[PDB]
mmCIF file of C-alpha atoms in Angstrom:
data_model
loop_
_atom_site.group_PDB
_atom_site.id
_atom_site.type_symbol
_atom_site.label_atom_id
_atom_site.label_comp_id
_atom_site.label_asym_id
_atom_site.label_seq_id
_atom_site.Cartn_x
_atom_site.Cartn_y
_atom_site.Cartn_z
ATOM 1 C CA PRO A 227 -37.380 -12.913 5.197
ATOM 2 C CA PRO A 228 -34.818 -15.509 6.286
ATOM 3 C CA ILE A 229 -32.142 -14.873 8.881
ATOM 4 C CA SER A 230 -28.831 -13.767 7.373
ATOM 5 C CA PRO A 231 -25.915 -13.735 9.847
ATOM 6 C CA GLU A 232 -23.656 -11.720 7.544
ATOM 7 C CA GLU A 233 -25.952 -8.724 7.938
ATOM 8 C CA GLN A 234 -24.816 -8.191 11.525
ATOM 9 C CA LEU A 235 -21.225 -8.393 10.303
ATOM 10 C CA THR A 236 -21.627 -5.674 7.656
ATOM 11 C CA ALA A 237 -24.267 -3.710 9.544
ATOM 12 C CA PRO A 238 -23.215 -0.106 9.969
ATOM 13 C CA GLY A 239 -24.091 0.337 13.625
ATOM 14 C CA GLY A 240 -23.101 0.033 17.265
ATOM 15 C CA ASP A 241 -23.860 1.213 20.768
ATOM 16 C CA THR A 242 -23.634 4.923 21.557
ATOM 17 C CA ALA A 243 -23.883 7.358 24.470
ATOM 18 C CA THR A 244 -27.345 8.297 23.114
ATOM 19 C CA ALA A 245 -27.768 10.842 25.911
ATOM 20 C CA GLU A 246 -27.749 13.741 23.455
ATOM 21 C CA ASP A 247 -29.720 11.418 21.156
ATOM 22 C CA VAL A 248 -32.677 11.781 23.511
ATOM 23 C CA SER A 249 -32.217 15.545 23.838
ATOM 24 C CA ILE A 250 -31.746 15.827 20.078
ATOM 25 C CA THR A 251 -35.319 14.482 19.778
ATOM 26 C CA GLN A 252 -36.998 16.799 22.287
ATOM 27 C CA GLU A 253 -35.569 19.855 20.564
ATOM 28 C CA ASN A 254 -36.724 17.999 17.432
ATOM 29 C CA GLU A 255 -40.227 16.780 18.230
ATOM 30 C CA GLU A 256 -41.371 19.988 20.006
ATOM 31 C CA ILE A 257 -41.028 22.129 16.875
ATOM 32 C CA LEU A 258 -43.435 20.602 15.249
ATOM 33 C CA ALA A 259 -45.279 19.845 18.534
ATOM 34 C CA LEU A 260 -45.446 23.579 19.261
ATOM 35 C CA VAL A 261 -46.529 24.314 15.678
ATOM 36 C CA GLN A 262 -49.529 22.200 16.647
ATOM 37 C CA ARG A 263 -49.764 23.902 20.048
ATOM 38 C CA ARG A 352 -45.298 -11.318 31.641
ATOM 39 C CA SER A 353 -43.231 -9.610 28.978
ATOM 40 C CA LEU A 354 -43.045 -10.863 25.417
ATOM 41 C CA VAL A 355 -39.706 -12.441 26.304
ATOM 42 C CA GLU A 356 -41.224 -14.788 28.886
ATOM 43 C CA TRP A 357 -43.584 -16.029 26.187
ATOM 44 C CA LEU A 358 -40.602 -16.626 23.917
ATOM 45 C CA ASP A 359 -38.915 -18.312 26.870
ATOM 46 C CA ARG A 360 -42.143 -20.295 27.111
ATOM 47 C CA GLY A 361 -42.209 -20.663 23.332
ATOM 48 C CA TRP A 362 -39.232 -22.992 23.355
ATOM 49 C CA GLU A 363 -40.229 -24.718 26.602
ATOM 50 C CA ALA A 364 -43.384 -25.651 24.696
ATOM 51 C CA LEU A 365 -41.560 -26.977 21.626
ATOM 52 C CA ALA A 366 -38.379 -27.980 23.465
ATOM 53 C CA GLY A 367 -39.191 -29.915 26.621
ATOM 54 C CA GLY A 368 -36.190 -28.358 28.310
ATOM 55 C CA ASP A 369 -34.772 -24.988 29.217
ATOM 56 C CA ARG A 370 -31.474 -25.604 27.368
ATOM 57 C CA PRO A 371 -29.496 -22.637 28.759
ATOM 58 C CA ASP A 372 -27.487 -22.458 25.515
ATOM 59 C CA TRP A 373 -30.658 -21.245 23.825
ATOM 60 C CA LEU A 374 -31.598 -18.770 26.549
ATOM 61 C CA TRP A 375 -28.777 -16.406 25.639
ATOM 62 C CA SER A 376 -29.603 -16.899 21.962
ATOM 63 C CA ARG A 377 -33.034 -15.413 22.678
ATOM 64 C CA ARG A 378 -31.290 -12.396 24.225
ATOM 65 C CA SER A 379 -29.096 -9.759 22.602
ATOM 66 C CA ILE A 380 -25.906 -10.997 20.928
ATOM 67 C CA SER A 381 -23.011 -8.670 20.088
ATOM 68 C CA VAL A 382 -21.142 -9.745 16.949
ATOM 69 C CA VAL A 383 -17.983 -7.766 16.161
ATOM 70 C CA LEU A 384 -16.159 -8.669 12.955
ATOM 71 C CA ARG A 385 -12.371 -8.674 13.217
ATOM 72 C CA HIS A 386 -9.380 -9.572 11.073
ATOM 73 C CA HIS A 387 -6.312 -11.648 11.830
ATOM 74 C CA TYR A 388 -2.998 -9.910 11.184
ATOM 75 C CA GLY A 389 -1.294 -13.247 10.544
ATOM 76 C CA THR A 390 -3.659 -14.825 8.011
ATOM 77 C CA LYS A 391 -5.463 -11.617 6.931
ATOM 78 C CA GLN A 392 -8.579 -13.732 7.481
ATOM 79 C CA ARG A 393 -11.506 -13.085 9.784
ATOM 80 C CA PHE A 394 -12.365 -14.175 13.302
ATOM 81 C CA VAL A 395 -15.546 -13.062 15.020
ATOM 82 C CA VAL A 396 -15.372 -11.656 18.545
ATOM 83 C CA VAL A 397 -18.664 -12.224 20.366
ATOM 84 C CA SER A 398 -19.967 -10.990 23.701
ATOM 85 C CA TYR A 399 -23.360 -12.197 24.837
ATOM 86 C CA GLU A 400 -25.885 -10.030 26.659
ATOM 87 C CA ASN A 401 -25.595 -11.759 30.059
ATOM 88 C CA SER A 402 -21.962 -12.754 29.429
ATOM 89 C CA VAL A 403 -19.634 -11.907 32.306
ATOM 90 C CA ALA A 404 -16.661 -11.661 29.936
ATOM 91 C CA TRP A 405 -15.716 -8.513 28.030
ATOM 92 C CA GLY A 406 -18.489 -6.811 26.091
ATOM 93 C CA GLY A 407 -21.188 -8.408 28.220
ATOM 94 C CA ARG A 408 -23.798 -6.182 29.817
ATOM 95 C CA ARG A 409 -22.884 -7.813 33.146
ATOM 96 C CA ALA A 410 -19.181 -7.215 33.726
ATOM 97 C CA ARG A 411 -16.874 -6.411 36.616
ATOM 98 C CA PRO A 412 -14.984 -3.091 36.840
ATOM 99 C CA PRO A 413 -12.410 -2.030 35.963
ATOM 100 C CA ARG A 414 -12.937 -2.656 32.264
ATOM 101 C CA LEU A 415 -10.523 -2.467 29.346
ATOM 102 C CA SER A 416 -9.428 1.032 28.338
ATOM 103 C CA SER A 417 -7.551 2.323 25.284
ATOM 104 C CA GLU A 418 -5.561 4.789 27.390
ATOM 105 C CA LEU A 419 -2.238 3.104 26.617
ATOM 106 C CA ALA A 420 -3.190 2.385 23.004
ATOM 107 C CA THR A 421 -4.868 5.620 21.879
ATOM 108 C CA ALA A 422 -1.984 7.799 23.062
ATOM 109 C CA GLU B 50 15.540 -10.511 -3.905
ATOM 110 C CA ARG B 51 12.075 -10.302 -2.344
ATOM 111 C CA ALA B 52 13.405 -7.778 0.177
ATOM 112 C CA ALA B 53 13.593 -5.034 -2.448
ATOM 113 C CA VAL B 54 10.395 -6.447 -3.962
ATOM 114 C CA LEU B 55 8.649 -5.881 -0.639
ATOM 115 C CA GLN B 56 10.296 -2.493 -0.107
ATOM 116 C CA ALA B 57 8.820 -1.288 -3.400
ATOM 117 C CA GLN B 58 5.403 -2.563 -2.303
ATOM 118 C CA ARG B 59 5.955 -0.811 1.027
ATOM 119 C CA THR B 60 7.166 2.479 -0.470
ATOM 120 C CA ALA B 61 4.587 2.621 -3.271
ATOM 121 C CA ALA B 62 1.487 1.904 -1.190
ATOM 122 C CA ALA B 63 2.827 3.888 1.781
ATOM 123 C CA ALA B 64 2.238 7.012 -0.298
ATOM 124 C CA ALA B 65 -1.238 5.776 -1.236
ATOM 125 C CA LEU B 66 -2.048 5.975 2.468
ATOM 126 C CA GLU B 67 -0.964 9.613 2.724
ATOM 127 C CA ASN B 68 -3.081 10.272 -0.351
ATOM 128 C CA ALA B 69 -6.113 8.652 1.278
ATOM 129 C CA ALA B 70 -5.019 10.235 4.564
ATOM 130 C CA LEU B 71 -4.820 13.741 3.114
ATOM 131 C CA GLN B 72 -7.966 12.863 1.189
ATOM 132 C CA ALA B 73 -9.621 12.285 4.566
ATOM 133 C CA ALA B 74 -7.554 15.027 6.204
ATOM 134 C CA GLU B 75 -9.735 17.314 4.074
ATOM 135 C CA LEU B 76 -12.828 16.055 5.909
ATOM 136 C CA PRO B 77 -12.290 17.406 9.472
ATOM 137 C CA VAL B 78 -12.846 21.016 8.378
ATOM 138 C CA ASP B 79 -15.914 20.203 6.247
ATOM 139 C CA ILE B 80 -18.860 21.297 8.396
ATOM 140 C CA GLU B 81 -16.387 23.552 10.191
ATOM 141 C CA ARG B 82 -16.408 25.163 6.746
ATOM 142 C CA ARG B 83 -20.058 24.255 6.122
ATOM 143 C CA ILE B 84 -22.374 24.906 9.042
ATOM 144 C CA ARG B 85 -20.420 27.555 10.954
ATOM 145 C CA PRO B 86 -22.065 30.005 8.521
ATOM 146 C CA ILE B 87 -25.293 28.077 9.127
ATOM 147 C CA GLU B 88 -24.521 28.357 12.847
ATOM 148 C CA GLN B 89 -24.724 32.131 12.391
ATOM 149 C CA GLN B 90 -28.519 32.145 12.259
ATOM 150 C CA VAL B 91 -28.738 30.436 15.676
ATOM 151 C CA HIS B 92 -28.888 33.456 17.975
ATOM 152 C CA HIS B 93 -30.459 35.487 15.171
ATOM 153 C CA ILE B 94 -33.519 33.452 14.239
ATOM 154 C CA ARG C 3075 -50.931 44.231 9.573
ATOM 155 C CA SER C 3076 -47.270 45.044 8.939
ATOM 156 C CA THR C 3077 -46.512 44.718 12.669
ATOM 157 C CA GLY C 3078 -47.230 40.992 12.891
ATOM 158 C CA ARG C 3079 -46.810 40.036 9.234
ATOM 159 C CA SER C 3080 -43.328 41.552 8.864
ATOM 160 C CA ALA C 3081 -42.206 39.923 12.123
ATOM 161 C CA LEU C 3082 -43.121 36.691 10.341
ATOM 162 C CA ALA C 3083 -40.893 37.421 7.325
ATOM 163 C CA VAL C 3084 -37.821 37.459 9.587
ATOM 164 C CA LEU C 3085 -38.937 33.973 10.628
ATOM 165 C CA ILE C 3086 -40.409 32.995 7.230
ATOM 166 C CA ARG C 3087 -37.164 33.632 5.345
ATOM 167 C CA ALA C 3088 -35.084 31.518 7.734
ATOM 168 C CA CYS C 3089 -37.432 28.528 8.005
ATOM 169 C CA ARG C 3090 -37.269 28.114 4.236
ATOM 170 C CA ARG C 3091 -33.541 28.660 3.695
ATOM 171 C CA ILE C 3092 -31.980 26.319 6.264
ATOM 172 C CA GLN C 3093 -33.370 23.493 4.120
ATOM 173 C CA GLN C 3094 -31.205 24.320 1.095
ATOM 174 C CA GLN C 3095 -28.419 24.966 3.597
ATOM 175 C CA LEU C 3096 -28.704 21.485 5.138
ATOM 176 C CA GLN C 3097 -29.542 19.657 1.892
ATOM 177 C CA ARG C 3098 -26.216 20.776 0.436
ATOM 178 C CA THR C 3099 -24.272 19.890 3.596
ATOM 179 C CA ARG C 3100 -25.359 16.258 3.270
ATOM 180 C CA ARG C 3101 -24.490 15.936 -0.422
ATOM 181 C CA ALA C 3102 -21.390 17.939 0.465
ATOM 182 C CA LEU C 3103 -20.350 15.320 3.038
ATOM 183 C CA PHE C 3104 -21.357 12.177 1.110
ATOM 184 C CA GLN C 3105 -19.341 13.370 -1.890
ATOM 185 C CA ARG C 3106 -16.443 14.268 0.432
ATOM 186 C CA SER C 3107 -16.840 11.179 2.624
ATOM 187 C CA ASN C 3108 -17.281 8.675 -0.215
ATOM 188 C CA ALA C 3109 -13.828 9.677 -1.442
ATOM 189 C CA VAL C 3110 -12.457 8.035 1.703
ATOM 190 C CA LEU C 3111 -14.162 4.714 0.953
ATOM 191 C CA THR C 3112 -12.983 5.010 -2.654
ATOM 192 C CA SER C 3113 -9.429 5.931 -1.658
ATOM 193 C CA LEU C 3114 -9.242 3.100 0.877
ATOM 194 C CA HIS C 3115 -10.064 0.347 -1.621
ATOM 195 C CA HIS C 3116 -7.542 1.850 -4.025
ATOM 196 C CA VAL C 3117 -4.945 1.214 -1.320
ATOM 197 C CA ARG C 3118 -6.147 -2.382 -1.174
ATOM 198 C CA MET C 3119 -6.077 -2.158 -4.970
ATOM 199 C CA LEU C 3120 -2.358 -1.438 -4.627
ATOM 200 C CA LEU C 3121 -1.787 -3.899 -1.779
ATOM 201 C CA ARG D 3075 -52.827 39.380 21.959
ATOM 202 C CA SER D 3076 -52.651 35.985 23.683
ATOM 203 C CA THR D 3077 -53.527 34.284 20.385
ATOM 204 C CA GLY D 3078 -50.379 35.334 18.538
ATOM 205 C CA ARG D 3079 -47.866 36.096 21.287
ATOM 206 C CA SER D 3080 -48.172 32.574 22.708
ATOM 207 C CA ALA D 3081 -48.227 31.163 19.170
ATOM 208 C CA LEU D 3082 -45.236 33.372 18.370
ATOM 209 C CA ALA D 3083 -43.405 31.794 21.321
ATOM 210 C CA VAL D 3084 -43.695 28.614 19.236
ATOM 211 C CA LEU D 3085 -41.143 29.610 16.590
ATOM 212 C CA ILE D 3086 -39.081 31.761 18.988
ATOM 213 C CA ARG D 3087 -38.180 28.559 20.812
ATOM 214 C CA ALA D 3088 -38.422 26.408 17.684
ATOM 215 C CA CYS D 3089 -36.065 27.992 15.164
ATOM 216 C CA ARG D 3090 -33.364 28.968 17.666
ATOM 217 C CA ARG D 3091 -33.177 25.546 19.369
ATOM 218 C CA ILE D 3092 -33.214 23.752 16.020
ATOM 219 C CA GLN D 3093 -29.985 25.542 15.131
ATOM 220 C CA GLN D 3094 -28.565 24.655 18.552
ATOM 221 C CA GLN D 3095 -28.548 20.980 17.564
ATOM 222 C CA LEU D 3096 -26.087 21.687 14.738
ATOM 223 C CA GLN D 3097 -23.428 22.771 17.257
ATOM 224 C CA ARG D 3098 -23.386 19.315 18.846
ATOM 225 C CA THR D 3099 -23.356 17.412 15.552
ATOM 226 C CA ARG D 3100 -20.387 19.616 14.674
ATOM 227 C CA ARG D 3101 -18.776 18.876 18.033
ATOM 228 C CA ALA D 3102 -19.690 15.206 17.804
ATOM 229 C CA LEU D 3103 -19.114 13.901 14.252
ATOM 230 C CA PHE D 3104 -15.870 15.811 13.565
ATOM 231 C CA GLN D 3105 -14.574 14.925 16.984
ATOM 232 C CA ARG D 3106 -15.404 11.300 16.095
ATOM 233 C CA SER D 3107 -14.412 11.366 12.414
ATOM 234 C CA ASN D 3108 -10.837 12.327 13.308
ATOM 235 C CA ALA D 3109 -10.417 8.924 14.950
ATOM 236 C CA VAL D 3110 -10.463 7.361 11.474
ATOM 237 C CA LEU D 3111 -7.514 9.564 10.507
ATOM 238 C CA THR D 3112 -5.655 8.477 13.649
ATOM 239 C CA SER D 3113 -6.028 4.863 12.531
ATOM 240 C CA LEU D 3114 -4.984 5.440 8.918
ATOM 241 C CA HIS D 3115 -1.750 7.173 9.885
ATOM 242 C CA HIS D 3116 -1.352 4.443 12.488
ATOM 243 C CA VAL D 3117 -1.784 1.854 9.733
ATOM 244 C CA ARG D 3118 1.490 3.134 8.302
ATOM 245 C CA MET D 3119 2.754 3.257 11.893
ATOM 246 C CA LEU D 3120 2.595 -0.526 11.670
ATOM 247 C CA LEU D 3121 5.046 -0.533 8.755
ATOM 248 C CA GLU E 50 15.742 -12.679 8.596
ATOM 249 C CA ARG E 51 14.779 -9.190 7.413
ATOM 250 C CA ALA E 52 12.430 -10.218 4.599
ATOM 251 C CA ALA E 53 10.283 -12.169 7.059
ATOM 252 C CA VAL E 54 9.622 -9.162 9.306
ATOM 253 C CA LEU E 55 9.438 -7.104 6.117
ATOM 254 C CA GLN E 56 6.896 -9.540 4.668
ATOM 255 C CA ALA E 57 4.954 -10.052 7.893
ATOM 256 C CA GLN E 58 4.153 -6.386 8.470
ATOM 257 C CA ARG E 59 2.743 -5.991 4.957
ATOM 258 C CA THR E 60 -0.062 -8.451 5.686
ATOM 259 C CA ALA E 61 -0.640 -6.967 9.145
ATOM 260 C CA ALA E 62 -0.970 -3.422 7.798
ATOM 261 C CA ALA E 63 -3.457 -4.363 5.076
ATOM 262 C CA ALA E 64 -5.534 -6.205 7.680
ATOM 263 C CA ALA E 65 -6.128 -3.102 9.809
ATOM 264 C CA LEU E 66 -7.225 -1.332 6.625
ATOM 265 C CA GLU E 67 -10.245 -3.614 6.529
ATOM 266 C CA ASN E 68 -10.547 -3.013 10.252
ATOM 267 C CA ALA E 69 -10.664 0.649 9.241
ATOM 268 C CA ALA E 70 -12.787 -0.099 6.166
ATOM 269 C CA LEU E 71 -15.890 -0.682 8.274
ATOM 270 C CA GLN E 72 -14.769 2.159 10.553
ATOM 271 C CA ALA E 73 -14.860 4.811 7.813
ATOM 272 C CA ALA E 74 -18.082 3.314 6.412
ATOM 273 C CA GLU E 75 -19.798 4.542 9.591
ATOM 274 C CA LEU E 76 -19.430 8.250 8.803
ATOM 275 C CA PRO E 77 -21.920 8.442 5.869
ATOM 276 C CA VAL E 78 -24.645 6.952 8.070
ATOM 277 C CA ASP E 79 -23.359 9.061 10.969
ATOM 278 C CA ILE E 80 -24.270 12.044 8.786
ATOM 279 C CA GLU E 81 -27.940 11.268 8.083
ATOM 280 C CA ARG E 82 -29.263 10.723 11.618
ATOM 281 C CA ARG E 83 -27.470 13.931 12.647
ATOM 282 C CA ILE E 84 -29.056 15.906 9.792
ATOM 283 C CA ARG E 85 -32.195 14.289 8.369
ATOM 284 C CA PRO E 86 -34.209 14.712 11.628
ATOM 285 C CA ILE E 87 -33.291 18.421 11.660
ATOM 286 C CA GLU E 88 -34.882 18.869 8.235
ATOM 287 C CA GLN E 89 -38.546 18.330 9.123
ATOM 288 C CA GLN E 90 -38.145 20.835 11.961
ATOM 289 C CA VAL E 91 -37.268 23.779 9.732
ATOM 290 C CA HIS E 92 -39.707 22.534 7.073
#
């Protein structure tokens, strides 16, 4: 199964609160249950360093999570892809400085 | 000339939105119609 | 007999029926939701 | 007595808490699905 | 001068539709994971 980048573009999914998605499961899996009654990443990071010969920080984020959000350009109607890495300090990155961007002006 | 040409395109499709809008304005009451009767059985059984 | 067994029927009837309740709700929503996707493209179809 | 009454506490918690989940999915999805409508009528708000 | 603004907004509006196209496409999958897991419970 080869890697297809356009999956992540058309993928129907995103991040969520997921708090009630844990509690949904415990009132799920008890139902049911009462009827009855060195990480891998470091090896990957050492996988390249074996076949690379260098850390190559550009690759290190590629081994991490990568957020790909498809957008459209009002001028050309065409597409431009907004990306926020996992360790990226910029918007969308899991490491970011508060305050962050809010829709308060826009949504109203 | 194109001004009216674009106005027609505006006006015509602008209704198609309200169609699709009121097509999807039928959705918000769906389970509110659907599972509120299913939500009856909650405290019962 | 009828003390425990009947107190099951109150529970037996419900644990069967919510299925057909939920099964419809899905196909209810998909059929109602998929009109949105269909209606949207038709707007593109106009535009 | 302790055979059934503790095995009856199974369903007593099971079938009532199952139907508690539906409340949230009602108060989640249809609170979320109305955002799509806000956009669509805002799409015309562009024009 | 009008037709430009009149033209420009037509393209802009149809763009956000495809911004909304993926948005609406979420709801059918939003339905399953909020229902399908509830089914085996009652089963």
